[PDB]
Structure 1
Amino acid sequence: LTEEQRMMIRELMDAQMKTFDTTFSHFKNFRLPGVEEAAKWSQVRKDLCSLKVSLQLRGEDGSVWNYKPPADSGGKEIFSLLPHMADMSTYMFKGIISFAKVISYFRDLPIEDQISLLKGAAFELCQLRFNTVFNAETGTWECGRLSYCLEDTQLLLEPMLKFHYMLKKLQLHEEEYVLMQAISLFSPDRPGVLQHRVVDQLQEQFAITLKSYIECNRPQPAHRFLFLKIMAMLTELRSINAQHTQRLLRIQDIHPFATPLMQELFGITSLTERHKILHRLLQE
């Protein structure tokens, strides 16, 4: 309700509008699939077997291209979709870097802390953004004309998939999603963060603003614990991020797939010296 909190929300909403391509209209020129080490490979097959999707592409003319992924025989076939996913990820991360760049509170932080927080949060803000275009009924991320759909076997076992169903079930507003994004972004306990106390205070103010928004703009006591439900989802998302970073690195080690922007974000081969693309993107 306070005017600072109103302008705080309006800044994030403005940011989200300027930087989230909801229709995926500008995502193009992306790749598609074609037409001791054993212990690493065993683990990498297990990693990919959880998060399998079919890919649907609706043409401007009314046509539909549908990709169904191969069953694991035990070879490079399991990596089929990695080049496409990397391009989609990279496209999404560029959106998140822009999102952070228009927040005044973020720009005021030293560039090393801006990098550290984006390293920490990029994945989480992608997943939060992907949740807004997720369809729980059909199990499908509707990315404009491009569309990722889960394969059968149940699915709820995989922490990342469980997260998407649970968050979507909360039926959050646009304002609540951007406030989740701000709380994730401004996390004081990410590695390499010098200004711990300032970021912690900013996080608190975003949390209070969300807590106050839910209190004021929703029925009570119906949504009595909704702020805490959101906080549980952020903690659970932070856990998934750690799990994800491990999985990606294991895969990368065997089968190099990551774009240069991803390599920097996940720590693949001074803080500004090691993250030159990210640094360049934050200056421009």
Structure 2
Amino acid sequence: KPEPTDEEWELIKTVTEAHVATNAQGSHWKQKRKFLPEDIGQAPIAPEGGKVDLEAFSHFTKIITPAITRVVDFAKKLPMFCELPCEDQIILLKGCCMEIMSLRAAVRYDPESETLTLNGEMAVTRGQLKNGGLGVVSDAIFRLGMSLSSFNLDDTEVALLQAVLLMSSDRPGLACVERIEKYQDSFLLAFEHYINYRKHHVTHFWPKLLMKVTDLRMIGACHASRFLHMKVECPTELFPPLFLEVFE
């Protein structure tokens, strides 16, 4: 099985460093994290269904800007992305923002505590993340977390996965569709070969990881439909500057 070529190791070093340089978990999150108090976002023990717990929502939005910002820095550290028109860059960033963020939290899933550590600092439960606003998306991200545990992804693999999510040529309104596909394929090929190098113990690893890319897309779309409910149920004063633009 083909391992990465010299040229691909460069790209790999480039994406890996960009990810690590913008991954706030570069200080042992597992040891640094703090658990969000059980009082916040607990089952509310209602007609019309899940109503966003403004209290919980408040804690999530107070640390969401840095997460959004870090996704932009990540893309901006990739030469290929920097070659794209300003218009495409934006379209791509808006389309993958929550996909990438979701991946980042999912990879910080902890079976023993049943939590996801947001921004490598805030540990939360299904209930908390659900009642805080993501609704069933909460369940989706946790499932992704559970399914990714056996994959043992390192920074390079998460970085490459982020880059594949970034170079999505099917986003609506893109100008350089063909060029973006070329970039994505280059990441896929490097990823594919890096995987062979690492030698994971799981059958049909490549095919299974690709399906995870699909889950993230589903997750990204649900985020958007989820944001619509937030706008109805949450007062403007709770929305950070960038958070709004992300779905605009």
Fold similarity call, TM over 0.5: yes
Map Cα deviations across residues 193-238 of structure 1 (whole Å, 9 max, x no partner).
110000011101101111111122216xx44521111110011110
2:99 paired residue number: 124
1:274 paired residue number: none
**TM-aligned CA deviation for residue 76 of structure 1:** 7.4
1:72 paired residue number: 44
Answer yes or no: is 1:242 the counterpart of 2:245. Answer: no
**TM-aligned CA deviation for residue 245 of structure 1:** 0.9
Q: Map 1:211-226 onto structure 2 (within 5 A).
A: 211-218=192-199, 222-223=201-202, 225-226=204-205
TM-score w.r.t. the length of structure 1 is 0.72
**TM-aligned CA deviation for residue 156 of structure 1:** 11
Q: Map 1:142-181 onto structure 2 (within 5 A).
A: 142-143=117-118, 144-151=120-127, 158-181=139-162
Q: Is the 8 A contact 2:92 2:167 kept in 1?
A: yes
TM-score w.r.t. the length of structure 2 is 0.82
Q: Is the 8 A contact 1:214 1:223 kept in 2?
A: no
Map Cα deviations across residues 90-119 of structure 1 (whole Å, 9 max, x no partner).
221111111111111111111111100000
1:206 paired residue number: 187
Answer yes or no: is 1:186 the counterpart of 2:174. Answer: no
Q: Map 1:85-124 onto structure 2 (within 5 A).
A: 85-124=60-99
SS of corresponding position for 2:125: strand
**TM-aligned CA deviation for residue 20 of structure 1:** 1.4
The CA RMSD over aligned residues, in Å, is 2.7
Matches of 2:79 and 2:217 in 1, distance apart? 24
Matches of 2:44 and 2:38 in 1, distance apart? 19
Map Cα deviations across residues 155-205 of structure 1 (whole Å, 9 max, x no partner).
999323212211233211221111100000110001221100000111011
Q: Is the 8 A contact 2:106 2:141 kept in 1?
A: no
Amino acid at match of 1:136: P
Distance change (3 Å), C-alpha of 1:208 and 1:128 = same
Q: Is the 8 A contact 2:106 2:144 kept in 1?
A: no
**TM-aligned CA deviation for residue 24 of structure 1:** 7.5
Matches of 2:121 and 2:220 in 1, distance apart? 27
Amino acid at match of 1:149: T
Matches of 1:88 and 1:177 in 2, distance apart? 21
SS of corresponding position for 1:80: helix
Matches of 2:155 and 2:121 in 1, distance apart? 22
* Structure 2: tracts of 5 or more residues without a match: 29-33, 129-135
Distance change (3 Å), C-alpha of 1:147 and 1:167 = same
Q: Is the 8 A contact 2:137 2:223 kept in 1?
A: no
Answer yes or no: is 1:15 the counterpart of 2:30. Answer: no
1:258 paired residue number: 239
Matches of 1:156 and 1:199 in 2, distance apart? 28
The structure 1 segments of at least 4 consecutive aligned residues displaced by more than 6 Å after TM superposition are: none
Higher relative contact order (CA 8 A, sep 6+): 2
Q: Map 1:42-57 onto structure 2 (within 5 A).
A: 56=35
The size of the alignment, in residue pairs, is 227
SS of corresponding position for 2:116: strand
Distance change (3 Å), C-alpha of 1:89 and 1:77 = closer
Q: Is the 8 A contact 2:126 2:142 kept in 1?
A: no
Give the number of the structure whose alpha-carbon radius of gyration is greater: 1
Amino acid at match of 1:82: F
Matches of 1:18 and 1:87 in 2, distance apart? 22
Selected match of 1:229 from 191, 198, 208: 208
Q: Is the 8 A contact 2:126 2:139 kept in 1?
A: no
